[PDB]
Design a protein around this ligand. Structure first.
Ligand code: HDE
Ligand code: HDD
Ligand SMILES: [S]
Ligand SMILES: [S]
Lengths: 726, 726
């Protein structure tokens, strides 16, 4: 008996805020959260308490602390099969990581539609508002390895596995509505350019290097998704506060056989929010697991990530009615032209039990569609359909990867396929071929129909020669970048400019920087001049005269392209650092903590050491972390309560905490004598927007703080930080 | 889409300082650097210039931009074999990463002994001071994935493959002279405890989490290597500035059959140097590839990493003469008791061509020994011999891993083994078995003997019963941690206290922190109290009365265990940041660069934008990076020349650059009006040891700065940094 007698080793099986309890496997943390897929995994879940330690063959082990040897100081004997089985399993624990999106965090939850969509699709999962579909969702970065950092600048993956009654549907999307390239044949060129360079394998988790910007400079089709990566879109606050997109035009097919073109959307119900670059980069160092941790702890807290599925729908007759090709995955469809229609809601409400078993081994692939959905000729989508099945044969060891428990359909599956490595299913069918008479031809084909029918492809007309040729309709590269640029706020534009400037400064060959700047001059002159200035590059007279590209179907902006132009803040699940002193004014802290609790905002009590401090009234305040141990990078706002300020007024870490949070545009609130920290951040006596201050934390102090938190960051402070030494 | 006409895409094939040229594959950067192993790889090196792009089957490709489709907007066709080969290769690029030491950086070089060691070993590679042995060396962390960060707190690996005339010898060592555990059987328990926890796969690259500290608190045998990990040894400045150790007692066997116990050492000729924690942690975010990059750039610069191989030799009859067991790998042999005898020098002088092929696929294993060497019954070593062959079967795809080019011996190999996946060698031998008459028994066994003989194991006497039992002589855990503690300088002690304090503050379960502090009370009360104070823990009366463990064979300390107590600094290969202004005083820059060049110290010229600035005399100065883009973390010292100081005096990044360098104990030099920055770091008029200052940069100024750099950091400044908000 090694556990503490007080039972404090074991986290309460009830929702608890971040940091309050150690984290745990989902079935231990939240045993009564269930769905059909979670229940179906019960046949393979393995417990431990009260069981004997054994070999994999079931033999109980007496001494798991020693190898068998000839004498207690002698040589280890080959007949020690317990040692060998244990070390063999260890020596083969690793499997190949994903070629891209190797870094990813996942959770279980469920989806339900708001209403039946039978008029536009026969997909069973969308047929009835009372039909609940379990999901498993993995969010990811793109470039870095499975052991790379979360808050890099990169695109994010958002993959959802829907366990429907008519088969697995995988919606394998990203957090921007387009991709860098037009044709899948170039995917290894593009990925090789952005991945670590081949001689030395540097840099990890970063497009800020020569080969990426060389490819970009030579392939102007990439510029649209580059604009997105260079914006604050490339550095999300949380996987809960990013948008999701299905990337391509697909089809919905209804019972009557009508095809409708569709693009998939996920809207984050917690709003859109991103970090700023200095903060994101420093956070990869202070907590490279910040997004993985945040997702897990939001779920443990009951701040379940929620997303609304939406569809942009385009009738078949309108295929050619846009300035851009609907099949070109480097073009978005502006919501001003084609609104997103709300479809249903997804809630992620339980973490995995074992990350390897459920997250690392999960296989998602956009060819896993169901009757009521179909593909289009998008030439990127078309090659994806090859890759996602092929890649599993090495990654997951063979063609039986659908029998790995997380991957299994909850729908029935039966067919004549046999054997392969790791075969689990034991087929009793006398027949392994069809047509057969020996089993009366079962299992049998099923005609398509309105429900529960076999899959049949939409009978799209194909006409043309066998050609390796890009459609001329795809040959336009600058208007969508420009539409994105013009849709961003002035602070968002600034962060785009700074993204390009920072990245191109890491490009060692200066001609590549020049070449990129020339491409920027084809998008927007102000953008190009500002990046040029930061690189000490002067635009030529020709570059200054490049006529900008056309508006997109008469649009000069679309505010849905901005993270921030239309406010959508939600404070629930956000977190505030509270900087303690050794004699806190307890009435300030009561007011602060209850106001935060009322809005579902968490807190972390910080000090210069661990343990406890005592408030003016004798309340014992438990310390969550030190100032250095839990830097302002990890919180959304900082509050300093009144009290013995002299305790921390000269603490370099305390001061720096505020300078850091100040630089990164976070709200800061200062009560009572905590106002002496005004001098540290240079705040005028009469105060400034984004700094909450009063004699005490009562009255409107917490409402004003919460109002600032609802708007995410204090963009007005940007000219002020430019000269802060932090 | 081509190269610039000025040829600036291509790095000069000459040694060049870091940042002067883009880095390149070793055979192109240094084509005249050769050794027997590098040459033998010529059969598989593949160029590219002037060659046609092809499939893997040698078919020239006309259009590498497009998939084959039916019309230019049509579906992709299954007959596109060029697309499918290219995507299939890409889909299967990844192989499983190493179970441990997955993160590593490697180079080629050579070794030679100083004198023949034939009196103690018949190993051919130690037999003649003029026989050169090619090596390939991989340096690594331990816990994190292949895409984790370099400057984490962790043990480092130091593995050397010697391609000898009598076979491959791999010396597979670490940067500390012991390991955490005693018996190989516990290796998966320990590794699982330090690795990301299994529910959520957090944290990456860090022992700062509950499971690791839980295991340590329950297994006091770990405390010795924990002491080393918590010290600054856990955060080396560079792989060139750490020691290497072979971890176990091995044996040398001479021609007369005499056995001598030996422990292996590598002494860095660039001296011993480590980061400080805050710097190390921030650098994992600002450059997670810092040690990989620094190693590669040192070799491109000609600052070849050099190490001296050294042996601790113990005669056989002295096996039991110490107060610890020689076979216990948690115990070190103090150099005060047994001196390291210098044996030879290893120089790393070329980088690989392709990191995957040469680095990722290299397989090192300590059972790969050669005649003249042998094992002992160390129970950690004993089990390692099982693991390093077994693990390659999955990692490298089968039993022909020695045919992967980097792993091939340069010595002949012939045997009767056949087949296995991706078998390269085509055996012509009529016989695949022995004894045979049909090939007159070739290849044949060879008797053991003085040189070129068959391997025979030293005939060690074994006497004991078949037992799973730890030797009673291994059951002492506190004396070596105490010896280590007492041998550290006071600032090294403080950093150890700080590492335990910082780590234990991230352990969520408070009873684990308490149990570790109790263990510390068994080693040293001063250490234990200092950690307790930071965790808000109070030692009990009993804990206060724990009798300190005994001295190690009479030793109160051994200064060879400290990084810094005996000066051994070498500035060649270090780097200085030079903060420019838009009118640099060229006379200062002239004298700065002249002095730096004379000691082989590199410079990086920094500014607030990229491009060029012009000095007072018209000299045009290209800018390597911005203040933000190459932070003071990445350099050893900072110099600010005179000139138009107003240009940068109110720049927040330039001021912070000095604040961060100051906090991290780095030398700073300020010439002319740059002395105005003394105000940002609160240096008094009189000046301060560690801040060099004068009217101009001259002989005296540079000598002073270079003296400071030879001492690595300004430890006397430590009292002054608590207050700086940085
Ligand atoms: C639309 C969102 C999107 C796009 C446009 C692409 N990826 Fe993805 N990808 C694989 C291949 C692949 C191809 C061939 C193309 C364009 C031709 C794309 N990608 C672009 C893959 C190598 O087969 C992949 C790696 C492992 C795997 O199972 O499939 C893969 C991963 C991936 C993920 C991660 C899903 C997960 O396992 O968490 C996501 C979200 C995308 N891709 C999105 C995506
Ligand atoms: C019984 C298991 C076992 C134990 C007890 C040890 N090792 Fe080990 N080591 C392995 C089992 C292993 C391994 C699992 O087999 C690895 C990873 C995969 C590989 O090829 O070997 C490995 C890799 C590995 C590497 C990386 C070589 C490379 O760059 O590829 C180094 C430097 C060490 N080990 C060093 C050590 C040291 C100094 C030890 C303490 C004396 C030690 N190992 C004990
Ligand atoms: S996409
Ligand atoms: S070791």
């Amino acid at each position: 008996s090694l556990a503490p007698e007080d039972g404090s080793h074991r986290p309460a099986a009830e929702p608890t805020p971040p940091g309050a309890q150690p984290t745990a496997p989902g079935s231990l943390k939240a045993p009564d959260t269930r769905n059909e897929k979670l229940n179906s995994l019960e046949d393979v879940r393995k417990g431990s308490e009260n069981y004997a330690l054994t070999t994999n063959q079931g033999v109980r082990i007496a001494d798991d602390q020693n190898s068998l040897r000839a004498g207690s100081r002698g040589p280890t004997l080959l007949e020690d099969f317990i040692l060998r089985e244990k070390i063999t399993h260890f020596d083969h624990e690793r499997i190949p990581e994903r070629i891209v999106h190797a870094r990813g965090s996942a959770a279980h939850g469920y989806f339900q539609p708001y209403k039946s969509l039978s008029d536009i699709t026969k997909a069973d999962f969308l047929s009835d508002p009372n039909k609940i579909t379990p999901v498993f969702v993995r969010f990811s970065t793109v470039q870095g390895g499975a052991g790379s950092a979360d808050t890099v600048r990169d695109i994010r993956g958002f993959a959802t596995k829907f366990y429907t009654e008519e088969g697995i549907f995988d919606l394998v999307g990203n957090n921007t509505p387009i991709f860098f390239i037009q044709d899948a044949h170039k995917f290894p060129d593009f990925v090789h350019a952005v991945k670590p360079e081949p001689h030395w394998a540097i840099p990890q988790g970063q497009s800020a290097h020569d080969t990426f910007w060389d490819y970009v400079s030579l392939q102007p089709e990439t510029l649209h998704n580059v604009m997105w990566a260079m914006s604050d879109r490339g550095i999300p606050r949380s996987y809960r506060t990013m948008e999701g997109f299905g990337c391509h035009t697909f089809r919905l097919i209804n019972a009557e056989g009508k095809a409708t073109f569709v693009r998939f959307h996920w809207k984050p119900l917690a709003g859109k929010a991103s970090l700023v670059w200095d903060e994101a980069q420093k956070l990869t160092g202070r907590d490279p697991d910040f997004h993985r941790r945040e997702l897990w702890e939001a779920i443990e807290a009951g701040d379940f990530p929620e997303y609304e599925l939406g569809f942009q729908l385009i009738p078949e007759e309108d295929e050619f009615k846009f300035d851009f090709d609907l099949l070109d995955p480097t073009k978005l469809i502006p919501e001003e032209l084609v609104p997103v229609q709300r479809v249903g809601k997804m809630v992620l409400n339980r973490n995995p039990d074992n990350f390897f078993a459920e997250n690392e081994q999960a296989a998602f692939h956009p060819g896993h569609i169901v009757p009521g959905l179909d593909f289009t000729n998008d030439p990127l989508l078309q090659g994806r359909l090859f890759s996602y099945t092929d890649t599993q044969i090495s990654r997951l060891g063979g063609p039986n990867f659908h029998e790995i428990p997380i991957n299994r359909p909850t729908a029935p599956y039966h067919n004549f396929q046999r054997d392969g490595m790791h075969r689990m299913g034991i087929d009793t069918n006398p027949a392994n071929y069809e047509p057969n008479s020996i089993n009366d031809n079962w299992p049998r084909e099923t005609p398509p129909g309105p429900k529960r029918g076999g899959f049949e492809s939409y009978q799209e007309r194909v006409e043309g020669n066998k050609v390796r040729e890009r459609s001329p309709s795809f040959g336009e590269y600058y208007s969508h970048p420009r539409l994105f640029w013009l849709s961003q706020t002035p602070f968002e534009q600034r962060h785009i400019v700074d993204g390009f400037s920072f990245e191109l400064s890491k490009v060692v060959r200066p001609y590549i920087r020049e070449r990129v700047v020339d491409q920027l001059a084809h998008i927007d002159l102000t953008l190009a001049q500002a990046v040029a200035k930061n690189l000490g590059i002067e635009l030529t007279d020709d570059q200054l005269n490049i006529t900008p590209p056309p508006d997109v179907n008469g649009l000069k902006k679309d505010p849905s392209l901005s993270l921030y132009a239309i406010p959508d803040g939600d404070v629930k699940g956000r977190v505030v650092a509270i900087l303690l002193n050794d004699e806190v004014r307890s009435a300030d802290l009561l007011a602060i903590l209850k106001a935060l609790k009322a809005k579902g905002v968490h807190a972390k009590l910080l000090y210069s050491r661990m343990g406890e401090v005592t408030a003016d009234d004798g309340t014992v305040l438990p310390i969550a972390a030190t100032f250095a141990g839990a830097p302002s990078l990890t919180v959304d706002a900082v509050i300093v309560p009144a009290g013995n300020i002299a305790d921390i007024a000269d603490n370099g870490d305390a001061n720096y905490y505020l300078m850091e949070a100040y630089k990164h545009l976070k709200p800061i609130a200062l009560a009572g004598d905590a106002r002496k920290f005004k001098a540290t951040i240079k705040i005028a006596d009469q105060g400034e927007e984004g700094i909450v201050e009063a004699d005490s934390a009562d009255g409107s102090f917490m409402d004003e703080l919460l109002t600032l938190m609802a708007a995410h960051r204090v963009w007005s402070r940007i000219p002020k930080i430019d000269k802060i030494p932090a």
